[PDB]
Design a protein around this ligand. Structure first.
Ligand code: SF4
Ligand code: SF4
Ligand code: SF4
Ligand SMILES: [Zn+2]
Lengths: 114, 182, 186, 67, 89, 89, 374, 209, 130, 118
């Protein structure tokens, strides 16, 4: 079920990690600047914590190509935060603080509607 | 729904007064505070300074009003560029997501008493792009709108009619007279 | 006239081919223009002159206009000369409405007639395009000529059938005039 | 001093806009039906203001325990 | 007596200052058309001709074909240039 | 206030204990005064001779599309569009 | 001077602008997706919204696209009306560009004097279509509706006086030293650099290229009008401004030719399956009613295919690439507005000029918004 | 004798037709097919690898000299295994003619970049990248253009809801604008405008596999 | 040792994360691949020749204000077309959805549909009227 | 001598014949390296040689302009230079070879998404 297809950037899973971890470097190194530049509530530790979870967001990615794109997205978002194109609203977006975590257990769902 | 009075009813009725409050004030403090409100409203009513946000398509009418056919500075309206010196904001055109935080920021950087006119359908309720992934459905969801000028765009007459309606709202606002009760 | 600088064929006009002469009368002319701002004087006197043209400001709302019989403004649901509702809920107006600003729900009135129950327009979604009236097969709905319908509250703009019928009653005379003007022509 | 743009009535509106050259005093060919209302201003920001509301009687009937 | 104009003096100076003979710009009822006009009749069309007017033998939408493959066109069967050379120079 | 009591011809009154009444504490509940059902009732049923009549309701192209209504039945016959009423007898 | 939309992220040293990143997309209104969901007739106003300064030219582009797909032709009278209003829009757009440009530089009086005359033209749009701007007057089967009597004459006097009005501002502002030095030799656009960046319109025509869509790929009744386009040889904002001014003058004589020769006849393609029938016929005959019914509810199936078209819109070669899947609903509608490429080149055009020069460059680009992001 | 039906420029069809064969037999390895759409335009269907060679060939060779690259129009078509299609619509001032180049690609494999060929394209590749997600290889800077910052998904795809997944408002607790799950006052009412009766026979069996 | 950097990868590449759809929809919603139903009171059948996918209805209430049909569910109208079910299943997997095909129909069995049977000497199938 | 080329940047160039001749020589050799069964080759020689044969008879630059058509010499040299780059790239591209890839079935078929009879 294999296909002999073009690459994008990374030719092997290890190069993929090499690229993926490079991004993790830029983001870790950037966090303090954004805490200063963007006047938002978030603090360095929380921003670091979210960065960890947000990589964990997709741990079981497998395809070399898919993981390459995820890194391509990150390098973009890095630059948009590195330079201050984004806005305090845009950067906080990662927390989703407007909506309360909706009910999850069956009764709370049942008693609160579909 | 009500309707205008008929010729003979008008004949019976007296002058409609000038200050919308009327001249029924009881005591000296009441009567005095009525006049000071009238003066304040007169100042804020006669001189009103739009900010000229004017994103799009609607903006062209926002310029035609400045044009010499339906002259607007005739009424005491001037386009100050700087929001710190602008008293009113005529939000006109569509409000995309990229713009939403910008409009919010511009609005509250302006000092009050600040009134917003939502010109055009695109600002009123998102207009023709209402079911779009990128547009703020209306501008009521970013800022407190004061006057709605329907149209796509509103004919210039319609826009400055709305301006006069804002002047009427600025005329009847009760701040000193009713602080006295507060 | 000075000669050109690029030879031009037809179907074109070069707007800079004219040469800046070096003739002494020509240079001294330009020099005098710069030394005494003749060109500014020409423009200066123009604006002085053009004070003496009467301004074209309409003394609104006393003086006002002009429009044309086809102007697309406030919506109105007309009624037959008997007073009966013209709309039959054919729902074309909704089917064509580019903004989907129209909502209709129709049933049978007790007489057995095909008529609307709810007929709604959102003039915060309408574009005043007039596709609705161009489509309606009985001229039930029309872009009435009123355009000063400005409201302080957003809710006040969402018209339902009661509001629309009221406008039709209020504006019937004018709408009758326009249609008599344009029906055979539209 | 409470003049308004909407004070013009229907029969005169067209003339006032250069929309009809026939003064209402002169052309009696316009309709003279009964149901026609009388004019009204932009009644807004006042107790006389319109406010929308559903124009469909409710959809589904609830079961009545008493009956 | 025809158009509201500033008094004749100011008119002459105004013409002097502009440097071109001035012609009025504001639109008067006299200047513009008879603002109420007779009812127009739109002449009937050439496809409204009453006979020999079959739709099937004049319709376009049913006439258009799919795109043709030029190589396969040849398989069924002056260096070429896209069109007349234009001296955009 | 009567404004929030009247029965819309469509047949709606907010129940006496229904929170949607609240929206009219400060604004009128417009209800139209002409009910088409009553008006068309008042209009008398026109009568003719021919088995089949035609109505456009309005006049010329200012009414509804021309419709032919047969009258052979004993009763009335209501125009589908305008609600005019016909009776042959 | 930023159209209310544009957001340039500039990096400056001293006062000069080194890096100039424009963030187009502060207006983008997902109009390609919406155009897909609606019907061809319903989709028509969208185009009039785009490049909102150009009212009718945008519609004519779309109508030509559909007519090329449907394999239909409009009658001469419809062609001439389209031509007439194509040029009236040309005068509208160029007034808008000149007036905005005059404010960019800081001259108020020109803008106001011209916006007086802009009111007369809009009134004409109002006379025909019933809307100040944003008519729907041009439609696939030709124009939506006939013209009211006497509108010909009123156009004549308006054209009669426009020479005076344009010359008043022209004499005031063309020669003026401040304006000349303020615009001249700003953002030189060499010929080769112009082509490889995908330019068009008076920008291209100003840089020296003798190209134009009207004379080369004629699409409307322009076959029957003789006239000359203007061309510059300096590629400055100034001589570009002159080209626009002469274009106003040349358009004027185009209205002379067309308005003089206007023939009688129908005002709509004869195919009642394509354009709606008239109300008079509708209320009597049967298939007129069916066609009225089906066109307004379902629209008309357009034969499958992809087609491109372009028009000499005032901003430049405005184009619509339209793909139809055979249904009544367009499958894909990509729109090429000239302002797009015209603005991308700014990042290179604006290099090292002063800040005041950058603003004036944005003006001479005349990148009206809506057409850029949508 | 059918004034309604237009008559194309036949001689233009002649020139484009012979020229099209010229292109096919000059670039055998790349040109997959060359067809002449009935609208008189000329389409050139290539494989994804030859994108730059075709464009470079066109802009340069005497007989093509197609210098201006009008746009990069992106088309999405599910049910084509590699669906995302691209269109390079070019002009030639020397000969006064238009040509269209077309290619395909999936949502995953990258695609050649025209930045190195025509400087005009630079923004367009950014536009398709934002609007579909079609990567471009060797593109200098692939920053998004239109969509707002931190926008997830590429809306012009046909598997993307019209109104998007989220929408913005303003918070007072936070003095800031927050994105929220979608919530529509009146759900967008589609209309099912499907033809029951085939209105076009000519395209029925034509173009079959 | 390369063909312009070609690589060997599995054909079935899940693209849920790159896609951008929120995981809530991905994890709580199915897809109903089928052929659109034939309208009962029609007779042309050139709109049921395609294989179509859509998402199950979530909810619709009515706006308290104006009695519209409010719906806070984005993929309600979403609708896509395919040429064959296997194509759609291939697509649906690549976008990481849950789906369950709905078998359209077996090939129509020929019906004799003779005209003469309307008029028979013995068979019951003689028409009562014309 | 013509004063201007009528275009910005495109300057008046002397010795056009020498430049055009030199450009034609190089491109001819550039195609010389090509294989003998390449359509690109087959035509470039005849076209270029037609140009490079027209270069001589008309010493006057304006006369040569009319004889060659296709635009003025100033652009015309650029046309030649473009093609020089084309040949060098063309040799590097090997496009005379046969099809690299066959389109998948139903790739270039319009309209899409319609069932079929096997
Ligand atoms: S409301 Fe109408 S005029 Fe205003 S921006 Fe929207 S489309 Fe343009
Ligand atoms: S088109 Fe006219 S008759 Fe039909 S539903 Fe709409 S308003 Fe009523
Ligand atoms: S004018 Fe146009 S948008 Fe407004 S209700 Fe009528 S059809 Fe709909
Ligand atoms: Zn009737």
């Amino acid at each position: 079920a294999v296909q002999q297809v073009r690459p994008i950037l990374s030719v092997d899973r290890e190069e993929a990690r090499k690229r993926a971890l490079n991004l993790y470097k830029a983001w870790y190194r950037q966090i303090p600047y954004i805490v200063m530049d963007y006047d938002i509530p978030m603090t360095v530790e929380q921003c670091r914590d979210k960065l960890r979870e947000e990589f964990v967001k997709h741990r079981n990615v497998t395809d070399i190509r898919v993981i390459d794109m995820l890194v391509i997205k990150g390098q973009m978002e890095l630059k948009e935060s590195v330079e201050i194109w984004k806005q305090k609203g845009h950067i906080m977006r990662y927390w989703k603080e407007s909506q309360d975590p909706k009910p999850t257990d069956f009764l709370s769902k049942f008693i609160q509607g579909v | 729904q009500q309707t205008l009075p008929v010729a003979e009813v008008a004949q019976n009725l007296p002058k409609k007064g000038y200050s919308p409050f009327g001249t029924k004030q009881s005591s000296v403090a009441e009567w005095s505070l009525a006049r000071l409100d009238d003066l304040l409203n007169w100042g804020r009513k006669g001189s009103i300074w739009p900010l000229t946000f004017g994103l799009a398509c609607c903006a062209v009418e926002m310029m035609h009003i400045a044009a010499p056919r339906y002259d607007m500075d005739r009424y005491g309206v001037v386009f100050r560029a700087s929001p710190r010196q602008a008293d009113v904001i005529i939000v006109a055109g569509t409000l995309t997501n990229k713009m939403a935080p910008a409009l919010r920021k511009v609005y509250d950087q302006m000092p009050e008493p600040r009134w917003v006119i939502s010109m055009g359908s695109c600002a009123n309720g998102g207009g023709y792009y209402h079911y779009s992934y990128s547009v703020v459905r209306g501008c009521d969801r970013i800022i407190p709108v004061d006057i709605y000028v329907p149209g796509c765009p509103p004919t210039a007459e319609a826009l400055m009619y709305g301006v006069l309606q804002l002047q009427k709202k600025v005329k009847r606002m009760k701040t000193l007279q009713m602080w006295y009760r507060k | 006239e000075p000669k050109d600088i690029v030879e031009v064929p037809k179907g074109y006009v070069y707007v800079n081919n004219k040469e800046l002469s070096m003739e002494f009368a020509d240079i001294t002319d330009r020099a005098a223009s710069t030394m005494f701002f003749g060109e500014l004087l020409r423009g200066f006197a123009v604006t002085l002159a053009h004070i003496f043209k009467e301004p074209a400001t309409i003394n609104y709302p006393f003086e006002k206009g002009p429009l044309s019989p086809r102007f697309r403004g406030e919506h109105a649901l007309r009624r037959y000369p008997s007073g009966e509702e013209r709309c039959i809920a054919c729902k074309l107006c909704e089917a064509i409405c580019p903004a989907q600003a129209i909502t209709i729900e129709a049933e049978e009135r007790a007489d057995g007639s095909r008529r609307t129950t709810r007929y709604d327009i959102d003039m915060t979604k309408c574009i005043y395009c007039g596709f609705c009236q161009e489509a309606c097969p009985v001229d039930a709905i029309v872009e009435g000529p009123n355009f000063e319908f400005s409201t302080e509250t957003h809710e006040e703009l969402l018209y339902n059938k009661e509001k629309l019928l009221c406008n039709g009653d209020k504006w019937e005379s004018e709408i009758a005039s326009n249609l008599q003007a344009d029906h055979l022509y539209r | 001093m409470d003049y308004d743009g909407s004070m013009i009535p229907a029969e005169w509106y067209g003339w006032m806009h250069y929309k009809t050259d026939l003064p209402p005093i002169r052309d009696g060919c316009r309709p003279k039906y009964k149901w026609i209302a009388d004019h009204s201003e932009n009644l807004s920001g006042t107790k006389e203001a319109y406010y929308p509301y559903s124009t469909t009687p409710n959809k589904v009937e609830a079961w009545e325990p008493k009956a | 007596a025809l158009r509201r104009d500033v008094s004749p003096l100011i008119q002459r100076i105004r013409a002097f200052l502009l440097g071109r003979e001035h012609n009025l710009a504001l639109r008067f009822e006299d200047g513009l058309a008879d603002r109420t006009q007779p009812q127009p009749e739109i002449p009937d069309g050439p496809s409204h001709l009453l006979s020999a007017n079959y739709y099937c033998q004049r319709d376009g939408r049913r006439e258009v074909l799919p795109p043709i493959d030029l190589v396969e066109q040849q398989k069924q069967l002056k260096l070429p240039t896209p069109g007349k050379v234009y001296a955009w120079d | 206030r009567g404004d929030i009591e009247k029965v819309t011809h469509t047949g709606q009154v907010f129940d006496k204990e229904d929170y949607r009444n609240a929206r009219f504490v400060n604004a009128k509940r417009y209800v139209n005064e002409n009910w088409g059902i009553k008006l068309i009732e008042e209009v008398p049923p026109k009568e003719c001779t021919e088995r089949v009549v035609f109505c456009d309701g309005g006049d010329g192209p200012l009414g509804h599309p021309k419709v032919y209504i047969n009258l052979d039945k004993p009763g009335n016959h209501i125009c589908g569009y305008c609600g005019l009423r016909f009776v042959k007898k | 001077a930023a159209h209310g939309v544009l957001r340039l992220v500039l990096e400056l040293d001293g006062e000069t602008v080194m890096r100039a990143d424009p963030h187009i997309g502060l207006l983008h209104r997902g109009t390609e997706k919406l155009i897909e969901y609606k019907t061809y007739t319903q989709a028509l106003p969208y185009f009039d919204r785009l490049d909102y300064v150009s009212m009718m030219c945008n519609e004519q582009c779309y109508s030509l696209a559909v007519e090329k797909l449907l394999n239909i032709d409009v009658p001469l009278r419809a062609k001439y009306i389209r031509t007439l209003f194509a040029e009236i829009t040309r005068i509208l757009n160029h007034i808008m560009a000149v007036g905005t440009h005059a404010l960019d530089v800081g001259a108020l009086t020109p803008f106001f004097w011209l916006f007086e005359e802009r009111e007369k033209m809009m009134e004409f749009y109002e006379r025909v279509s019933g809307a100040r701007m944003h008519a729907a007057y041009i439609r696939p089967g030709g124009v939506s509706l006939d013209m009211p009597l006497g509108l010909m004459d009123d156009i004549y006097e308006f054209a009669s006086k426009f020479a005076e009005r344009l010359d008043e501002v022209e004499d005031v502002l063309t020669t003026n030293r401040i304006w000349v030095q303020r615009t001249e030799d700003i953002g030189i656009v060499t010929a080769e650099e112009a082509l490889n960046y995908g330019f068009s319109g008076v920008m291209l025509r100003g840089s020296g290229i003798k190209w134009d869509l009207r004379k080369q790929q004629p699409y409307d009744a322009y076959n029957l009008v003789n006239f000359d386009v203007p061309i510059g040889t300096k590629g400055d904002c100034y001589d570009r401004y002159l080209c626009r001014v002469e274009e106003m003058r040349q358009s004027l004589r185009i209205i002379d030719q067309c308005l003089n020769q206007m023939p009688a006849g129908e005002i709509k393609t004869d195919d009642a399956k394509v354009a709606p029938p008239s109300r008079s016929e509708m209320k009597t005959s049967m298939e007129a009613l069916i066609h009225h019914f089906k066109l307004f509810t379902q629209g008309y199936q357009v034969p499958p295919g992809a087609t491109y078209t372009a028009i000499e819109a005032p901003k430049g070669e405005f184009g619509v690439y339209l793909i139809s899947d055979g249904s009544s609903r367009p499958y894909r509608c990509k729109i090429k507005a000239p302002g797009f490429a015209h603005l991308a080149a700014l990042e290179k055009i604006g290099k090292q000029h002063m800040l005041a020069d950058v603003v004036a460059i944005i003006g001479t680009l005349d990148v009206v918004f809506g057409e850029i992001d949508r | 004798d059918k004034p309604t039906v237009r008559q194309p420029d036949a001689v233009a069809r002649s020139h484009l037709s012979d020229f099209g064969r010229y292109v096919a037999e000059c670039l055998p390895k790349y040109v997959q097919k060359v067809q002449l759409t009935a609208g008189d335009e000329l389409e050139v269907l290539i494989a994804p690898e030859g994108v730059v060679p075709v464009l470079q060939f066109l802009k340069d060779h005497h007989q093509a000299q197609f210098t201006n690259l009008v746009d990069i129009a992106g088309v999405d078509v599910p049910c084509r295994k590699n669906r995302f299609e691209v269109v390079y619509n070019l002009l030639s001032l020397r000969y006064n003619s238009r040509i269209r180049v077309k290619t395909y690609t999936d949502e995953l494999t990258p695609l050649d970049s025209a930045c190195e060929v025509h400087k005009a394209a630079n923004w367009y590749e950014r536009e398709i990248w934002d609007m579909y997600g079609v990567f471009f290889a060797n593109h200098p800077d692939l920053r998004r253009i239109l969509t707002d910052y931190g926008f997830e998904g590429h809306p012009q795809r046909r598997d993307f809801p019209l109104s998007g997944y989220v929408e913005l408002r303003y918070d007072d607790e936070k003095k800031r604008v927050v994105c929220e799950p979608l919530e529509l006052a009146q759900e967008f009412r589609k209309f099912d405008l499907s033809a029951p009766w085939e209105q076009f026979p000519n395209f029925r069996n034509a173009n079959p596999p | 040792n390369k063909l312009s950097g070609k690589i060997t990868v599995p054909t079935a590449v899940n693209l849920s994360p790159i896609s951008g759809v929120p995981e809530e929809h991905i994890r709580e919603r199915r897809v109903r691949i089928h052929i659109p139903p034939k309208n009962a009171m029609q007779s042309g059948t050139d709109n049921v020749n395609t294989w179509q996918i859509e998402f199950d209805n979530r909810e619709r209430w009515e706006n308290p204000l104006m009695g519209w049909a409010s719906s806070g569910d984005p993929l309600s109208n979403m609708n896509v077309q395919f040429g064959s079910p296997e194509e759609a299943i291939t697509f649906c997997e690549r976008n990481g959805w849950r789906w369950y095909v709905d078998g359209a129909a077996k090939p129509k069995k020929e019906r004799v549909k003779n005209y003469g049977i309307n008029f028979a000497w013995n068979k019951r199938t003689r028409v009562s009227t014309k | 001598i013509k004063a201007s080329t009528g275009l910005t940047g495109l300057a008046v160039s002397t010795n056009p014949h020498h430049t055009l001749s030199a450009l034609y020589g190089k491109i001819l050799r550039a195609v010389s390296k090509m294989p003998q069964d390449a359509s690109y080759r087959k035509y470039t020689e005849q076209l270029v040689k037609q140009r490079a044969d027209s270069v001589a008879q008309h010493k006057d630059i304006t006369a040569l302009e009319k004889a060659v058509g296709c635009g003025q010499v100033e652009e015309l040299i650029v046309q030649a230079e473009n093609e020089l780059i084309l040949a060098r790239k063309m040799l590097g591209w090997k496009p005379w070879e046969k099809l690299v890839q066959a389109a998948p079935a139903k790739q270039w078929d319009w309209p899409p998404a319609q069932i079929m009879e096997p």
